[PDB]
Amino acid sequence: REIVHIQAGQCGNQIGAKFWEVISDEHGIDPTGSYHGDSDLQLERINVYYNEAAGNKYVPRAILVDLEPGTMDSVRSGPFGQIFRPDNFVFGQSGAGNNWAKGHYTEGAELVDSVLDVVRKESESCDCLQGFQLTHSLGGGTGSGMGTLLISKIREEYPDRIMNTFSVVPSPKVSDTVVEPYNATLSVHQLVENTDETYCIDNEALYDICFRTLKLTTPTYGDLNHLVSATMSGVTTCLRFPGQLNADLRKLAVNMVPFPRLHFFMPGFAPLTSRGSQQYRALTVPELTQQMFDAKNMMAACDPRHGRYLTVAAVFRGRMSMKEVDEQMLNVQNKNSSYFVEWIPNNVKTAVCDIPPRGLKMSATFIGNSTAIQELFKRISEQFTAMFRRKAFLHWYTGEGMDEMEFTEAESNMNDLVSEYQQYQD
Amino acid sequence: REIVHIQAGQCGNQIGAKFWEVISDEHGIDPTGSYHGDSDLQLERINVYYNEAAGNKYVPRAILVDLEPGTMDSVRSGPFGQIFRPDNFVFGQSGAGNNWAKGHYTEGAELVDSVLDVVRKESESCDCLQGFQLTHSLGGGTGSGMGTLLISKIREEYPDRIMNTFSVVPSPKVSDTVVEPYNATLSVHQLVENTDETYCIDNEALYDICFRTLKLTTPTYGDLNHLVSATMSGVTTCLRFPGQLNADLRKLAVNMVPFPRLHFFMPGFAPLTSRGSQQYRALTVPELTQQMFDAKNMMAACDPRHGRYLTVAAVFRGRMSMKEVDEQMLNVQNKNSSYFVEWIPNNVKTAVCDIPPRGLKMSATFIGNSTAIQELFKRISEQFTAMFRRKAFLHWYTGEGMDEMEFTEAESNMNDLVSEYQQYQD
Amino acid sequence: RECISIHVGQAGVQIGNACWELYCLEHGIQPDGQMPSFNTFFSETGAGKHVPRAVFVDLEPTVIDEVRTGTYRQLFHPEQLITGKEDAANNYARGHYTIGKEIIDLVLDRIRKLADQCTGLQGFSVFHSFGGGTGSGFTSLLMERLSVDYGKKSKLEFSIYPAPQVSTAVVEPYNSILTTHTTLEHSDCAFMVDNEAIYDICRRNLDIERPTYTNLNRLIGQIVSSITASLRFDGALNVDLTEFQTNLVPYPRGHFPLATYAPVISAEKAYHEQLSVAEITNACFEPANQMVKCDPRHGKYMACCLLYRGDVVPKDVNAAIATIKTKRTIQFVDWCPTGFKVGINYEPPTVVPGGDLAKVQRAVCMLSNTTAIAEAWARLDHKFDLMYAKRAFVHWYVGEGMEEGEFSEAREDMAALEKDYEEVGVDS
Amino acid sequence: RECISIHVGQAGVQIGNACWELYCLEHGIQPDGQMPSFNTFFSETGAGKHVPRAVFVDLEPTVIDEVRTGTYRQLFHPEQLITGKEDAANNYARGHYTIGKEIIDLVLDRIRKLADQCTGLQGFSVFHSFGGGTGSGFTSLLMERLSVDYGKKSKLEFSIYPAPQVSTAVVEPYNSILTTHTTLEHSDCAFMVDNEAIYDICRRNLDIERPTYTNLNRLIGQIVSSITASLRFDGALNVDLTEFQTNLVPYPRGHFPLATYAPVISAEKAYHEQLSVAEITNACFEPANQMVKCDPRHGKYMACCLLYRGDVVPKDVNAAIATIKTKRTIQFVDWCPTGFKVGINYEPPTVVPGGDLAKVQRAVCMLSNTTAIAEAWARLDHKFDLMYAKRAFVHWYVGEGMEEGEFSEAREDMAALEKDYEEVGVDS
Numbered sequence A, B: 001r002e003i004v005h006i007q008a009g010q011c012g013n014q015i016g017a018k019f020w021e022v023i024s025d026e027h028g029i030d031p032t033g034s035y036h037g038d039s040d041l042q043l044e045r046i047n048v049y050y051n052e053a054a055g056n057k058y059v060p061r062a063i064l065v066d067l068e069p070g071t072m073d074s075v076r077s078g079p080f081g082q083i084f085r086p087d088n089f090v091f092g093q094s095g096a097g098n099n100w101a102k103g104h105y106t107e108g109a110e111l112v113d114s115v116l117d118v119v120r121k122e123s124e125s126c127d128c129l130q131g132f133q134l135t136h137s138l139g140g141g142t143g144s145g146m147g148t149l150l151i152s153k154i155r156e157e158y159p160d161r162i163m164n165t166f167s168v169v170p171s172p173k174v175s176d177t178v179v180e181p182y183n184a185t186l187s188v189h190q191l192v193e194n195t196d197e198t199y200c201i202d203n204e205a206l207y208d209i210c211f212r213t214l215k216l217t218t219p220t221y222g223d224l225n226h227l228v229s230a231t232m233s234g235v236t237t238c239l240r241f242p243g244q245l246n247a248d249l250r251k252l253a254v255n256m257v258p259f260p261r262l263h264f265f266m267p268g269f270a271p272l273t274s275r276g277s278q279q280y281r282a283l284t285v286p287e288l289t290q291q292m293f294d295a296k297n298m299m300a301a302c303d304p305r306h307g308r309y310l311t312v313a314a315v316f317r318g319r320m321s322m323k324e325v326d327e328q329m330l331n332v333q334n335k336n337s338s339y340f341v342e343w344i345p346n347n348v349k350t351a352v353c354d355i356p357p358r359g360l361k362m363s364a365t366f367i368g369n370s371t372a373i374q375e376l377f378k379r380i381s382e383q384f385t386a387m388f389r390r391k392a393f394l395h396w397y398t399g400e401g402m403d404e405m406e407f408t409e410a411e412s413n414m415n416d417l418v419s420e421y422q423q424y425q426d
Numbered sequence C, D: 001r002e003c004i005s006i007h008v009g010q011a012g013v014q015i016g017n018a019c020w021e022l023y024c025l026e027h028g029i030q031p032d033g034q035m036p037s038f039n040t041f042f043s044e045t046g047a048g049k050h051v052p053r054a055v056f057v058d059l060e061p062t063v064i065d066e067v068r069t070g071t072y073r074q075l076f077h078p079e080q081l082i083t084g085k086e087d088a089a090n091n092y093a094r095g096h097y098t099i100g101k102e103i104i105d106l107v108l109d110r111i112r113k114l115a116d117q118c119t120g121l122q123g124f125s126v127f128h129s130f131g132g133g134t135g136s137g138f139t140s141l142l143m144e145r146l147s148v149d150y151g152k153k154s155k156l157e158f159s160i161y162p163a164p165q166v167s168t169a170v171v172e173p174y175n176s177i178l179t180t181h182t183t184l185e186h187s188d189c190a191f192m193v194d195n196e197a198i199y200d201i202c203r204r205n206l207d208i209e210r211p212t213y214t215n216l217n218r219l220i221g222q223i224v225s226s227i228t229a230s231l232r233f234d235g236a237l238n239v240d241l242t243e244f245q246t247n248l249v250p251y252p253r254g255h256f257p258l259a260t261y262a263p264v265i266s267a268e269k270a271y272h273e274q275l276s277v278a279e280i281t282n283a284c285f286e287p288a289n290q291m292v293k294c295d296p297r298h299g300k301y302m303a304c305c306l307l308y309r310g311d312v313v314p315k316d317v318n319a320a321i322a323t324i325k326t327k328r329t330i331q332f333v334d335w336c337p338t339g340f341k342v343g344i345n346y347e348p349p350t351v352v353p354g355g356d357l358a359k360v361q362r363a364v365c366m367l368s369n370t371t372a373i374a375e376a377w378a379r380l381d382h383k384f385d386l387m388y389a390k391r392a393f394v395h396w397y398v399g400e401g402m403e404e405g406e407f408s409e410a411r412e413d414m415a416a417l418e419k420d421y422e423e424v425g426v427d428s
């Protein structure tokens, strides 16, 4: 039950930097590799995430991908870089330059061949692959461009493994590039088609969490990605660890998706709390559900009170009663059934993991799949049309070899995607 | 079971310089001769490689051949020179000068008579000769020219002993002489005909190992030949030492060669690792097989994924289970049977030697005989035709007494050799 | 004199965890196997170590891992501890075919070996959930195979039935539809258990406001042991399980007995306590003590069996029966008159250290066939149809090779299942 | 009362390493030879030192060197320790003629001297691999010579048969084709042993995921000792090996018995254990416990002999036989009805310090003639033909003077060997 983690692009590498830190702490693994934890859990399920080398060394089953060493170099240079083997630093020079066409279509493909060779080498060492996880930004040339190439080729090799990816949704407040939503559309066109599931991450919403609910002052990407990693680990650690309602991801996905083409997720983390609150807030499952249900804790700028939920996953960590959980789950559906899909009478899936989080007594994560997600796609299409009409910057991509009808096709597919949510929205 | 080692030419002497160093360390023998090791192995099988003189002295059963003292003088002058007896320094003055005709046909032959006299004297002292090993460069006048004379005369004297030679394949990046591939062709013509087996060594590939896989910076011939010697000793030490699947070389060869005229080998060493990797790499038989199978660890510029393997030898050193080895061996053949010959259902030969390497816990070496080898011969023939057409430099050889039809014949035989691989290539 | 217990799926194994604990309780069986002195569930070695005759199947190692790292791991042998690797993904198709088919040969052989090791195989009992993959699908696979090989042995199933309101997986109704049919087809008896009813009992009768499955399964196991452990042990009116088959199922397609348990008393409650046979059996007819959320009131009753432990006298039992006849509100079918089998085991009811139930001096369970069960299936039926109308989630099975008609077919089989109660209740 | 064991080839000697260890185990024989108190395998001197009656042949000193530098080197005498110098190179031609012919005179004389030193020579048993040079070729040479001189003594061979999938030498199928023929011709019985099956047993029954030949040979030796050591020692139903010849081979060309061993239990497994005669003999008929990768199912059975150690009673054995008759799936030939010889040695089964098998109280092996063996030969046959079609490697034997027709001839002899099973299985 191994999981392959591929980090790609400036952000994928940066996000994954926090993710692996978290995981290492979760299992009591020293930055230089050795395990010093004290629970059976910490040892026994390393498996998934680390290769045990002699000497008690554990190496992350992951590859860091980019066309510039920069980001990866800073990681290697600093803390936790030492846990990574040289073989996980696959990069060229020069980068794409935020160009999807160069990443996917030209230049990074060349690197991708070596990336996948390494992946293959890891898949040979794997005992039992459960699946793959990619971390990247939707609008990024290497993250998404190269990432989408990797996805299409990995699924080719392994149709039956879980293909998942976590992606950053371009935020209205932070464009980089003019064609950031262009890159996103191009990737979406492939991402939808080639993955089993993808997570929607909106920085702007994450900032909202940071300050509005956590009242923190200055979010860095590391703090924001810390938040993200909490949910990523929330998801998979319970896959790893024993529990009561184990929800393998695959199973989950099964349950999450009623329709093959709608595989977008809305994660949210529950025990979000400011420090002040610590002294005032009781922690119960209903408390966690209050924070799960509340749209303000969503990690993406989509309002679940606007859209309708297809599926809701409710991840629990810690020794909760089944009654308490089940009753509260039910209570949520009793209250606002109107925001759920009509044809499924129980749209919320519990998944309780016995194992407590470190530190917290209880923890929970919300994962959903709602029609509200279409709003972000609409934002993309909106911008795209402006851009497309005047081919702004397109010449750069044209030089790479992209056709206007190719982009049009991608747009169409975006339009389809939005209509698909409309079909079940109502 | 003695082995005679003849080093010839600038490189044979230089390569052998590292080889004997390695061997001496393998057996705990001091540079000045005496044995100070501590294992039974180190003592009991010296036999093969050293003559025990009174006083606990061991002398390498080998002869250093050249027409200039230069190289041998530097060896004698420096470390380990003291382990060699004066009788092993057989040289004249002047050299050939990179001229095969002078080496083989004229001048070095005169020296060769004294060389072989010494060889004979050693063969008289031998108890039980297993065979002979020559180290040389294919395109070298004294290495190969004189070497080929030695080979033809030794086999004459001893048809039933193993005639083997290790030879350097002219690399595209390093010519010396214009007629370096000419010399190679001329020698090949005799080498094929007069040896039982020969090893293909391509410097360019060895550099690739040095940096690409080992990430070392500045290869010297000594570092590169260190690598070579690791494989040479890999091969024969297990011949010497007890093991489970002892694979005498003769037996091996039997198994390696389906057809009398195809006796070329593709060695590769397995525990190739950079220093960095040390802290991250687990060492298992599958790990070793991953590095054996991977074409990037081949010591010659031939791609085994291009050609087809006739035979694969798998040398193991250390206490491995038979299951682990046998299962993994099988696994390789299961995966890529398409790169193996059709008419042999088990094309890989294990040879496990019980005895561990010094230091490493496990070690392995790949030896193969594949059709991919023809690529180097093609490079030779390619160059040759250019050269032959305009007799460039041929006048130098003409002066020595070489005929154009003689070279043509040699070419034909090269062409035959290539076609022979084609016949089994498919 | 022996029978084998099979635990498939998480729920099956988690119940099994309670079951072997209980059998250790019943005789004071040490972890090493000491136990003097009962070989219906255990087999003895010459070491004096007795081991259970049971099989645990989980296609992910995780649950069994907990068994192998838990107490009692000395008592269990790897033979019984079946672990797969990879997952059946919540779908009957893989559970029954794709994955299960790979492991089932192992499983079947292990069962066969144990069967050969038994002397006087009465049959077997299987614990599973109706809604899962493995629990259902794999189980299904297994039951078909067991019906081939062990044709005339008892086939009892204990199936957990999803609460209409609480569900943890969206395709549970889809899986259960496939399951049910096949189950029926090969089973001799299937018990339905509804987690919500049990939760209600835990909070209302046991007064426990924080139940987990571990305590829920303690209840279930206690009941089950009273049903089976006890029946092989000797009593005052020693009844066997094959006798219950004969005496439980009036119809060829009989068969879905409902069990209740009614002395389910908190420690505190038990102080005051005095529950006579009559009092206990009154509690058995309360909806609150049903074990399945159904409501006896509106169904008809067909067989009603009462299983006794401890301090019970036949005369008083008969008086309690008369009370039941009097108190009727028990809409018995006209097909059967009076068909209420009693079994009485002298052995006192047991209590588990770690439980929360007070020690009772007498204990009675009630087995019953009622038509009210169909209501539970109707709830499911509508859920099934809704999903199938959209064909939601179907691709998870179609990619696995399932045919749409197969699912619609299975629903039609469910209709026939509902019709079984219609038929029975209908006619008189 | 005596017999001699000959170990030829690496494998033969490595098995021998286990064999003499085992005989030391059987009586508590000290390195110096003390042993009181069994002279079937040892001969006694007036020093009180008993030495084995065995011959080890290796044409390279290396293996014997390990013997002479190992434990037990006090027990072995140089007479028995035959070393050559140079190599037979993996080829029958040198093994049989070129090299072997030089050493064989020594070897034969040493055998002859030991034969003269025996009192009551029953015969001899030879351990070798089918595929080698010396192991095959030299062996072949030897067997011919022994059939000349010791015409009426027993000729048992224990031949390791290359696993169809794992091979260490390309000319093994070429060597085995020559070997087989001659072996048959002079042998009374040849055992086939398949390393892969044994590996499977080691990992599945013994649970050892890192087997080496040293532990594989421990298994083999244990079995062999139960077959022979034991047969000369006294029991309840003391059977001899010559009786097995009489009772093992129905056909003149009989003869390729298959042995299985079935109590092959890990220490841990053995805790739970209870393997009765019936249980053990069921295990003997499992493909998993075969020792050769073949599958009993599709062959026919002709003789089946059961060899018992320790805690065994005839009545219960007979009951187990009845079980076997019942459980049949044993396609016995109509030629023979019921021909299942049992031999029972009171002496308990032994365990080697250093082994990984649990102490068992009773042990049973099964010897059998089946037609399924031909399948193994068919695999080889195709490999042989492929090589011969190309004439690959043939020059290694042609330079040694072999004729092409000799190899094709030998294949035709193999066809006749396959025909032996055809014949037998065919007719009824």
Ligand SMILES: CC(=O)O[C@H]1C(=O)[C@@]2(C)[C@H]([C@H](OC(=O)c3ccccc3)[C@]3(O)C[C@H](OC(=O)[C@H](O)[C@@H](NC(=O)c4ccccc4)c4ccccc4)C(C)=C1C3(C)C)[C@]1(OC(C)=O)CO[C@@H]1C[C@@H]2O
Residues within 6 Å of the ligand: A021, A022, A023, A025, A026, A223, A224, A226, A227, A229, A230, A231, A233, A234, A271, A272, A273, A274, A275, A278, A357, A358, A359, A360
């Ligand atoms: C004294 C004490 O109890 O301190 C708590 C604490 O004060 C609070 C505020 C923590 C704190 O988290 C944050 O302030 C935070 C910072 C950036 C982004 C997101 C969150 C805490 O830093 C985080 C830390 O979390 C963990 O230890 C979890 O195991 C968590 N670990 C990490 O995120 C992690 C951080 C650094 C290095 C390695 C891992 C985790 C969660 C899900 C899955 C895997 C791991 C906890 C409980 C605390 C501190 C230390 C103050 C809270 O967060 C989490 C994820 O638990 C914020 O609201 C919760 C409520 C906690 O009570």
Ligand SMILES: CC(=O)O[C@H]1C(=O)[C@@]2(C)[C@H]([C@H](OC(=O)c3ccccc3)[C@]3(O)C[C@H](OC(=O)[C@H](O)[C@@H](NC(=O)c4ccccc4)c4ccccc4)C(C)=C1C3(C)C)[C@]1(OC(C)=O)CO[C@@H]1C[C@@H]2O
Residues within 6 Å of the ligand: B021, B022, B023, B025, B026, B223, B224, B226, B227, B229, B230, B231, B233, B234, B271, B272, B273, B274, B275, B278, B357, B358, B359, B360
């Ligand atoms: C602390 C420690 O464990 O150091 C190792 C070490 O770091 C590594 C990197 C060694 C090292 O080898 C090299 O760096 C190297 C340099 C030039 C050419 C080729 C290799 C090592 O130098 C080589 C040395 O090898 C041996 O000792 C073998 O017996 C080897 N000996 C020689 O090649 C030799 C070198 C100098 C003088 C005399 C002999 C050998 C191999 C096959 C057959 C016979 C002998 C070893 C294990 C190490 C060091 C010392 C760092 C490695 O190589 C070998 C041949 O073992 C390189 O990848 C392997 C993996 C080893 O772990």
Ligand SMILES: Nc1nc2c(ncn2[C@@H]2O[C@H](COP(=O)(O)OP(=O)(O)OP(=O)(O)O)[C@@H](O)[C@H]2O)c(=O)[nH]1
Residues within 6 Å of the ligand: C008, C009, C010, C011, C014, C015, C088, C089, C090, C091, C095, C129, C130, C131, C132, C133, C134, C135, C136, C160, C161, C162, C163, C167, C168, C169, C193, C195, C213, C214, C216, C217
């Ligand atoms: N009473 C009881 N019900 C349980 C228990 N565990 C799970 N259930 C119920 O059984 C159903 C859950 O089945 P799952 O655990 O999802 O699946 P499974 O049947 O084990 O098989 P898979 O789907 O392949 O994992 C739900 O309706 C749960 O409410 C338990 O320990 N006790």
Ligand SMILES: Nc1nc2c(ncn2[C@@H]2O[C@H](COP(=O)(O)OP(=O)(O)OP(=O)(O)O)[C@@H](O)[C@H]2O)c(=O)[nH]1
Residues within 6 Å of the ligand: D008, D009, D010, D011, D014, D015, D088, D089, D090, D091, D095, D129, D130, D131, D132, D133, D134, D135, D136, D160, D161, D162, D163, D167, D168, D169, D193, D195, D213, D214, D216, D217
């Ligand atoms: N069971 C078992 N099989 C072995 C052992 N050693 C080798 N074999 C098998 O026997 C065959 C090997 O024969 P070799 O060791 O190559 O040769 P040999 O028969 O000793 O004689 P030569 O070829 O002349 O060396 C292969 O099929 C091996 O798998 C051993 O110790 N035990």
Ligand SMILES: Nc1nc2c(ncn2[C@@H]2O[C@H](COP(=O)(O)OP(=O)(O)O)[C@@H](O)[C@H]2O)c(=O)[nH]1
Residues within 6 Å of the ligand: A008, A009, A010, A011, A012, A014, A015, A097, A098, A099, A137, A138, A139, A140, A141, A142, A143, A144, A168, A169, A170, A171, A174, A175, A176, A201, A203, A221, A222, A224, A225
């Ligand atoms: N959450 C998050 N978003 C990031 C990070 N880095 C870049 N992004 C987002 O990613 C988009 C830019 O794409 P980028 O990652 O630079 O593309 P690439 O590097 O060329 O593949 C912007 O919407 C950013 O907000 C990060 O570390 N965390």
Ligand SMILES: Nc1nc2c(ncn2[C@@H]2O[C@H](COP(=O)(O)OP(=O)(O)O)[C@@H](O)[C@H]2O)c(=O)[nH]1
Residues within 6 Å of the ligand: B008, B009, B010, B011, B012, B014, B015, B097, B098, B099, B137, B138, B139, B140, B141, B142, B143, B144, B168, B169, B170, B171, B174, B175, B176, B201, B203, B221, B222, B224, B225
């Ligand atoms: N690996 C290797 N190649 C060598 C060495 N010395 C010369 N060569 C190669 O040998 C060829 C030149 O032949 P050379 O040895 O000078 O011939 P000779 O000395 O006249 O017999 C070139 O292809 C070199 O790369 C060496 O020490 N190691």
Ligand SMILES: [Mg+2]
Residues within 6 Å of the ligand: C009, C010, C134
């Ligand atoms: Mg499960």
Ligand SMILES: [Mg+2]
Residues within 6 Å of the ligand: D009, D010, D134
């Ligand atoms: Mg040998």
